[PDB]
Amino acid sequence: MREIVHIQAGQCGNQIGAKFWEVISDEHGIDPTGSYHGDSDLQLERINVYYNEATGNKYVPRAILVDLEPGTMDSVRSGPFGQIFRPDNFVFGQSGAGNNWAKGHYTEGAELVDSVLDVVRKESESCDCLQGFQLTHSLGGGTGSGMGTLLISKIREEYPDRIMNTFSVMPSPKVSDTVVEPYNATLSVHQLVENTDETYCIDNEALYDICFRTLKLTTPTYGDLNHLVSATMSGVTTCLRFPGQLNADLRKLAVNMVPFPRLHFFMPGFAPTVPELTQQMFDSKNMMAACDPRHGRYLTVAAIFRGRMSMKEVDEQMLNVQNKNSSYFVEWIPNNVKTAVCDIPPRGLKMSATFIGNSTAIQELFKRISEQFTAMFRRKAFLHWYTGEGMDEMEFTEAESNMNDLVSEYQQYQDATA
Amino acid sequence: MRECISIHVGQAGVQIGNACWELYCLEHGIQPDGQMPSDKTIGGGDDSFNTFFSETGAGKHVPRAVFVDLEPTVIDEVRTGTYRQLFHPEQLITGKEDAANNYARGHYTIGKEIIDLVLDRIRKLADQCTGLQGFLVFHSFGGGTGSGFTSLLMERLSVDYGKKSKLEFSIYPAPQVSTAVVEPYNSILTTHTTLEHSDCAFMVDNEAIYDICRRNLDIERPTYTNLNRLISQIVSSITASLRFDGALNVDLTEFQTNLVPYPRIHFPLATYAPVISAEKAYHEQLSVAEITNACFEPANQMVKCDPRHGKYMACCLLYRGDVVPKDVNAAIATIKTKRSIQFVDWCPTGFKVGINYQPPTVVPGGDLAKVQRAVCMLSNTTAIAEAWARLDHKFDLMYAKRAFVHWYVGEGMEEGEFSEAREDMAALEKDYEEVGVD
Amino acid sequence: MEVIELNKCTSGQSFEVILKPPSDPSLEEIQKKLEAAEERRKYQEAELLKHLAE
Amino acid sequence: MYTFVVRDENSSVYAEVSRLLLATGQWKRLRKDNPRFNLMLGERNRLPFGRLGHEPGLVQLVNYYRGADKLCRKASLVKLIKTSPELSESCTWFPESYVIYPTTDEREVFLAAYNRRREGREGNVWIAKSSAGAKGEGILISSEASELLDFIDEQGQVHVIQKYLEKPLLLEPGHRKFDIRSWVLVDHLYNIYLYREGVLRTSSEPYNSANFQDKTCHLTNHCIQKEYSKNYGRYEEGNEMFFEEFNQYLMDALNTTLENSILLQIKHIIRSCLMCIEPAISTKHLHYQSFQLFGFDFMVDEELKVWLIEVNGAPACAQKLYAELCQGIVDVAISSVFPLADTSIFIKLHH
Ligand SMILES: COc1cc(OC)c(Cl)c(-n2c(-c3ccccc3)cc(=O)c(C)c2-c2ccc(F)cc2)c1
Ligand SMILES: Nc1nc2c(ncn2[C@@H]2O[C@H](COP(=O)(O)OP(=O)(O)OP(=O)(O)O)[C@@H](O)[C@H]2O)c(=O)[nH]1
Ligand SMILES: Nc1ncnc2c1ncn2[C@@H]1O[C@H](COP(=O)(O)OP(=O)(O)CP(=O)(O)O)[C@@H](O)[C@H]1O
Ligand SMILES: COc1cc2c(c(OC)c1OC)-c1ccc(OC)c(=O)cc1[C@@H](NC(C)=O)CC2
Ligand SMILES: Nc1nc2c(ncn2[C@@H]2O[C@H](COP(=O)(O)OP(=O)(O)O)[C@@H](O)[C@H]2O)c(=O)[nH]1
Ligand SMILES: [Ca+2]
Ligand SMILES: [Ca+2]
Ligand SMILES: [Ca+2]
Ligand SMILES: [Ca+2]
Ligand SMILES: [Mg+2]
Ligand SMILES: [Mg+2]
């Protein structure tokens, strides 16, 4: 009875979240109508974490769909699992955000934010013991970034003692389709650094490379990329959704993954013999964030293996990776690599592994955005679009300072010794 | 007849608590429904097995136990387990959300909200006691509840039952068996706060239990069931003196007077032998001298350490089964010559022995083999301090960089308590060194 | 190396073997500590809501 | 591959085998505090023995035996020999010794011995030494018990008084003193390996029975010889005579051999000492394994009887022999536990 309230905002948030509900609905064996037609009772032991039990034994996700542009709502509602969701949980506007963070955070999103919190109060009050919230959104746009972080700030006011998770698609180093994304990303990161307990960094360029270089898709699409992200989201939340040797929640994950409150930005991975999975799983080629783990040290790591597989074999292989490449792990957090196993594998797979790393190498990402942010901000390029919504330049300078301070923090523990 | 109340705190204490009360019922012939045909005194009695069980007019023998956890997952299984009928629901207390591996959350935040209810339910059992002796507290060092709430309860028990004795059964964290990066923090904090309120504490290192299970029972990946069933055997042998007629360790107060000349050094090392796989075809019966010698092999201890490099201040031998005093005395004589056994000059080099003719019991379908003679040795050796140093070193590595400290401060604790408790452990480690090293 | 303090019963027997001879806070104090911790949490939460109010 | 750590940065012997292990290409060096090591080249003082054998999935080896200090300390050794039945207080290969505490003390015991030898006009030269003494200083020889105790009171650390060998075997040409150093390796299986190559450490000043003031002719520490010895290195390079030459000298000068006259007694002393402590330090059933290299110091009297004087748990090798001995440590004490990818120099002393 540790329920999670899911929220998805913006195109990216809704497209990624919609595919996420498709994935776990299959894992819990729930059809688009919301009725269970599975085989094992282990699919239901912890189903109330992500679903409400409705009259007629229909299952309804604790999902809240948000955007300032109604177009993406209609796509969700007409998608494979469109009619699963609660009609009243579609909270949308008509104006859109125009890739403008200020519109999403201060004007257009501020008009709609209360309506979203009202839907949150419904869901949260209908929870035996509310555990926390999870958000899926992009940082480069205006709604998921600007309004997304506004929703986070408001939720922390009502629920200051609850856990806030996010799955944030970050700007990629070379692939971009938004000219002002450095402004939007830097403004969002300064919000995420303060009002989130855990943030999974997702990079579309890395996801595209996997789809193209590895999976051999000659014409990858956002559907293919979303499938990879959804597969990772299911893998991360496997322990929250299924029983097993591990009985842990989101707060325990944060307590053990975050040695310092601001450094809570994780590097996700996914794979694909047991030895070969652990080899893949730690590979740069399998990392969902555009940062080389070899360019830093892991503060903490979490690995989840799924499917019938030799436990002792995994333990030996994991322990080998730690001891073999121990120079990439901080020496002052003893036993900072923990592993969990679940008997239920995903669809069309016999074995799978999900990776969650709190690596100091993630500062490379915040370096990039800072340098891109400064190049535009020095010349106040495109700024009038933000000051026109009522922002002041000082709010831009503060975000620049904070993300540089965050970058400064990461470098501190990347060279710390015992 | 003086009663003993058992309090199980957190996941480890509760799950171990069940394995213990599962075994107690088998050793006494108590059925899962609570009715034991062997009992002639219905609705009461002054029998020794009543020290752990109360009786009802209906014939049910109700354990004198309380299970407490800050989330209901573990205790729910108790309420719906094979032994569900055995306890009245009131003895099972559960919260809503756990301490999340945070000593502060279990001690300060949530401990304050549930302490009064727990003490009331304990006092309900005490009111059914005519000569209550003390408490046996089962808990883990690592869990947020096991470490945080337990230290709070032990403080209140020293207040509400000042004269009564308190014994600990503590699970020492081990990387092999599902630990958390912050368990060294929790283990140090709960030891510091509980040290002055615990008369005698039996540590059990999951590393040692894990290796014993994986080596002597041929279990590739031991589960919590494997470890708890083995842990229950050592606990049962330690508590048998309270549940059966005898003249040794019959009172909780006797436990430390026979094992603890120094108040703070109250962590006796437990060694158990023989551990035999039931899968073993027709395991040849071992001898008294053979199992007694195994009590000095480090591979059989509950805490992997080297008593040869410490000093003993007390030693007890607890035999179960067909054992005659002549064989025990013969075995001791022979192994004093072979083994390195150095007592402190201010104590006598002696062994307090006890024999219970009932052979050890084994759970049906369990991994332990039905043996005819078994022994558990309890020795207060300074070598157990090796465990504190290991834990203290891990504490130091993280605390030097204040990793995870913010989680504890956020719950109301001050960084001062981190350094205060570490200072206490530095003193405890040094106390051990003065006694056990020249 | 003598056996002393031997005691026997039908359940068992016990004895000793000498190989060689030799050569708390009150309740209110508890709650003040718990109250001091609660005040610290409340002050921390007040600063959060104050900053969120700004 | 394997991993190891170095925590005795001033160790001459283990500084070189740290380079040997890296040269193999199947080993790597982590820093002091990284706990994920297969081998530890631990510190000399207060090595954290309690933290070994607890890292999951890592067989761990250490280059020291927990408890060997009982044999490598001047005070402990005398107590260990007198209280162990294996060796006993009447031990014959160990000079008469007594532990003395300045300011469990045997002052009056040694006082009963000196007076006994005063009645019979027997030799009464004694030497006081201690582990505190360093760099060839802190050791005084006298035939007056009063002088010895007084010197021990100015010093602070525990001291021991040992019957001085007034009649040492003297090499010719030179009429000079010497001591013998044997290097012994004990692996994790507790096999006792005696290095084939020993060394005589020679005084370059003729042994002067008259005055013990000039301690250059009485103390044969290479350390002191370089300090205040004129004739340094006159006979053998650096006052280091080796077995091949000494064996030839024994043949030419005394119609005997090094094996029969001396080495047979050396092997017996090494076994007796190490077997005496095997039950206390053996790691055959421990969560971690141990090996250690010792350095036994011997004195030969004119009757070709071998005496033991000191034992070193952190000894230094001879410059000519570092290459061979250090390589042996890897083959016997390390590669045995950690095999690499696909003639002996030691003498195995049998159980
Ligand atoms: C993030 O900025 C983008 C820039 C860009 O071209 C410069 C493209 Cl094509 C895409 N993009 C689009 C798309 C977006 C906006 C307008 C039209 C098409 C749709 C689509 O399904 C996929 C997979 C991608 C994509 C993602 C990550 C890559 F590494 C490579 C391609 C995204
Ligand atoms: N031997 C044994 N140890 C256990 C068992 N369960 C948990 N542990 C140990 O306990 C530690 C985890 O803390 P728990 O006691 O489970 O947590 P808790 O007491 O419920 O407190 P919370 O943090 O609130 O959940 C780990 O170090 C485990 O090694 C068990 O069933 N048997
Ligand atoms: N009983 C004795 N009779 C004669 N000479 C002795 C003696 N005991 C010691 N010596 C001389 O004193 C010298 C050093 O003695 P000792 O062994 O106490 O010093 P030490 O421990 O610093 C040597 P190391 O540094 O190799 O351990 C030896 O070279 C030896 O010649
Ligand atoms: C969602 O449920 C999870 C919850 C947790 C963990 C985790 O990763 C395996 C989870 O799955 C993703 C977790 C990870 C961090 C730690 O390692 C650094 C740790 O010690 C702590 C672990 C978990 N503890 C154990 C023994 O597995 C508790 C926290
Ligand atoms: N993975 C994924 N990323 C997307 C998708 N749509 C947009 N993005 C990312 O988000 C950015 C555009 O922001 P957008 O989603 O329109 O944000 P919005 O304005 O809040 O709706 C691009 O740079 C993409 O990297 C999608 O369908 N899938
Ligand atoms: Ca408007
Ligand atoms: Ca409202
Ligand atoms: Ca009865
Ligand atoms: Ca008390
Ligand atoms: Mg728990
Ligand atoms: Mg010396």
Nearest residue by C-alpha to atom 8 in ligand 1 = A177
Residue whose C-alpha is closest to residue A231's, from A272, A261, A190: A272
Which chain A positions have a beta carbon within 8 Å of D30's beta carbon?
326-327
Place of tokens 């350490």: B305
Q: How many CB pairs under 8 A join B and D?
A: 40
Q: What is the rounded distance in angstroms from the CA atom of residue C28 to the CA atom of residue A287?
A: 54
User: Which residue type sits at D13?
Assistant: V
Cα(A339) to centroid(ligand 4), Å:
7
Q: For residue A404, give every residue at least 6 positions away whose Cβ sits within 8 Å of its Cβ, in sequence order, or none.
A: A370
Residues B10, B142: Cα–Cα separation, whole Å: 10
* Helices assigned H by DSSP within chain D: 12-24, 69-72, 74-83, 107-119, 145-154, 222-227, 243-254, 258, 264-281, 322-329
B355: chain C residues, CB-CB within 8 Å: 12-14
In chain A, where the domains are located:
1-259, 260-361, 362-416
- Closest approach atom of ligand 4 to CA B178: 26
Q: Tell me which H or E stretch contains B40.
A: none
Q: How far apart are CA D30 and CA D21, in angstroms?
A: 12
B191: helix, coil or strand?
helix
Nearest C-alpha neighbor of A186 from the set A418, A338, A407: A407
CA distance A369 to A375: 10
Q: Which of A257, A305, A352 to mutate to test the pocket of ligand 4 (most atoms within 8 A of CB)?
A: A257
Q: Using CA atoms, how far apart are residues A239 and B415, in angstroms rounded to an integer?
A: 32
Closest atom of ligand 5 to CA, residue A104: 20
Q: For residue A234, what are the contacts with CB-CB under 8 A and spacing of at least 6?
A: A20, A23, A24, A27, A346
D64-95+167-351 has which CATH code? Answer: 3.30.470.20
* CATH code of domain A1-259: 3.40.50.1440
- Alpha-carbon distance of B320 to B241, in angstroms, equals 11
Backbone break loci in chain C, preceding residues, C–N > 2.5 A? 23
Which residues make Cβ contacts (< 8 Å) with residue A181, sequence separation at least 6?
A99, A139, A140, A141, A171
Distance of CA A406 from the midpoint of ligand 5 (Å): 25
Would you say how long chain D is, in residues? 351
Interface touch B180/A338, C-beta < 8 Å: yes
In single-letter form, the type of residue at position D262 comes to I
Query: Which of B155, B345, B414 minimises the CB distance to C30?
Result: B155
Do C and D touch, 3+ Cβ pairs within 8 Å? The answer is no
According to DSSP, the β-strands at D306-312 and B269-273 are unpaired
Question: Running DSSP on this structure, what letter comes out for residue D235?
Answer: S
Report A:143-182 residues touching C (Cβ under 8 A). 153, 156-157, 160
Closest-CA residue in chain B for D34? B397
Residues 6 or more apart whose CB falls under 8 angstroms from that of A38 comprise A28, A29, A30, A44
Which residues of chain D are within 8 Å of residue A417 when distances are taken between CB atoms? 31, 33
Candidates B308, B329, B317; CA nearest to B379 is: B317
Gap from CA of B54 to ligand 8 centroid (Å): 8
Nearest CA-CA partner of D152 in D165, D135, D140, D166: D140
Q: Which residues contact A54 (CB under 8 A, 6 or more apart)?
A: A34, A60
Domains for chain B: give ranges and CATH numbers: 1-268 (3.40.50.1440), 269-383 (3.30.1330.20), 384-438 (1.10.287.600)
Resolution (A): 2.6
DSSP character at residue D232: T
**Nearest Cβ partner of A312 from B182, B221, B398?**
B221
Report the gap between the CA of C50 and the closest CA in chain B (Å).
Answer: 17
Identity at D332, one-letter amino acid code: V
Strands D306-312 and C12-20: unpaired
Burial of B174 (0-12, 13-18, 19+ CB in 10 A): buried
DSSP string, A344-408: ---TT-S-EEEEEEEEGGGHHHHHHHHHHHHHHHHTTTTTHHHHTTT--HHHHHHHHHHHHHHHH
Domain with CATH 3.30.470.20 in chain D: 64-95+167-351
The number of the ligand 2 atom at minimal distance from the alpha carbon of B147 is 19
A106 SS3 class? coil
Strand B200-205 relative to strand B269-273: parallel, antiparallel, unpaired?
unpaired
CATH 3.30.1490.20 placement within chain D: 96-166
Fold of the CATH domain D96-166: Dna Ligase; domain 1 (3.30.1490)
Across the interface, of B207, B338, B339, the residue whose CB is closest to D54 is B207
For residue D173, cis peptide bond before it (omega within 30 degrees of 0): yes
Of B168, B207, B254, B417, which is the active-site residue?
B254
Residue type, A307: G
CA distance A331 to chain D (A): 6
The pairs formed by B281-285 with CB atoms below 8 angstroms and a separation of 24 or more are: B283/B369, B283/B371, B285/B371, B285/B372, B285/B373
CA-based R_g, chain C, Å = 30
Residues whose CB is less than 8 angstroms from the CB of residue A151 and which lie 6 or more positions away in sequence, other chains included: A7, A9, A66, A113, A116, A117, A135
Six token digits for residue D70: 């009982």
D127 CA → ligand 3 middle, Å: 9
Q: Which residues of D129-148 are buried (b: 16+ CB within 10 A; e: fewer)?
A: bbbebeebebbbbbeebeeb
Atom of ligand 5 nearest to the CA of A148: 20
Whether the Cβ atoms of residue A100 and residue A146 lie closer than 8 Å to each other: yes
Rounded Cα distance, B104 and B272, in Å:
35
The first and second tokens of residue D139, run together, are: 């050791």
Q: Check C37 against B410: CB less than 8 A apart.
A: no
Query: Rounded distance, CA B119 to CA B106, Å?
Result: 16
Structural fold of domain A362-416: Helix Hairpins (1.10.287)
CB contact under 8 A, A153 and C48: no
Do C and B make contact, counting contact as 3+ CB pairs within 8 angstroms? Answer: yes
Q: Which CATH superfamily is domain A260-361 in?
A: Tubulin/FtsZ, C-terminal domain (3.30.1330.20)
By DSSP bridging, strand A90-92 and strand A63-67 are parallel
What is the number of other CB atoms lying within 10 angstroms of the CB of residue C19? 16
Contact partners, residue A244, CB within 8 Å, separation at least 6: A340, A341, A342, A343
> Bridge partners of A341?
A305
Domain D1-63 fold is: Rossmann fold (3.40.50)
Contacts of residue B74 in chain A, CB cutoff 8 Å? 247
Task: Tell me the one-letter amino acid at B151.
Answer: S
Query: Does B155 participate in catalysis according to the annotation?
Result: no
Deposited experimental method: X-ray
Q: Are B70 and B110 in contact (CB under 8 A)?
A: yes
Would an 8 Å CB–CB cutoff place D58 in contact with chain A? yes
Do residues D186 and D149 touch, judged by C-beta distance below 8 A? Answer: no
CA of D201 to the centre of ligand 3 (A): 11
Ligand 2 pocket at CB < 6 A:
B 10-12, 15-16, 69-70, 98-101, 106, 140, 142-146, 171, 173, 177-179, 183, 206, 224, 227-228, 231
* Cα–Cα distance, B405 to B403 (Å, whole number): 6
A267/A264 Cα distance (integer angstroms):
10
**Contact (CB<8Å) D56/B297:** no
> Is some CB atom of chain B closer than 8 A to the CB atom of D85?
no
From the CB of A284, is ligand 1 less than 6 Å away?
no
Closest ligand by atom to B52 CA: 8
